[PDB]
Amino acid sequence: LSKALQCSLHGDTPHASNLSLALKYLPEVPDVLSCLELRYKVDWPLNIVITEGCSKYSGVFSFLLQLKLMMWALKDVCFHLKRTAMAGSVQFRQLQLFKHEMQHFVKVIQGYIANQILHVTWCEFRARLALEEIQRAHAEYLHAVFRGLLTEKAAPVMNVIHSIFSLVLKFRSQLHPNFALMQQSYNTFKYYSHFLFKVVTKLVNRQPHLEDFLLRINFNNY
């Protein structure tokens, strides 16, 4: 962390300190999980407002970090394949189209997160403020966890995301000795994605937040 803040080009203030990069579990040993927290710290006249439970940032953080694990690992195979280039054949071009087909799904679910949890939920609670109200207004700003698909109500929508993230990690393992072993993997990816579009649609009749998701995942397709 003390090496990270130097490369931030924004910070290194009294605010920038108090970033205890601690942990909460001891991992034993291809998955998409790496548990790790990141807790802010405050002092007395501010601790009375920012509750020691509003712990929920750590809930929304471990998701957002997990997302970066895709756009880096997927960037690796995009960079790992670059050095392979003479070698032009059907086995090659048909392989790279999988990456462009899998990357776009991550670059759209991220574009959603970068619209709900950082911009529109921040429009409120910024033009909303301008002593008891500060407790509730803050308890309504973060409650960012609803539009973030972390709520147990829309949990089945989140369970399917792991099946997507897992297959991309397997795609990174096989950095054409085993092409067919990868061809089966991509076909499993196109099925699960095609299943997501149905489970979200069926969950529209029962949440205006999810409405913008179908417009994101689907555009000139079915």
Binding site: W44, I48, L131
Partner: protein, 45 residues
Amino acid sequence: PVLLSLLKTSCEPYTRFIHDWVVFLKHIAHDIYVCGKTINLLKLC
């Protein structure tokens, strides 16, 4: 008068408590509870 002169002094110490943070209609009941804790919080800052 006699009851008033009692009430006028039977509330003397209670005003002092009220003079720190600075049935009946509940529209002001819960407000007094917070109107004091703010003063007791600024005293430590």
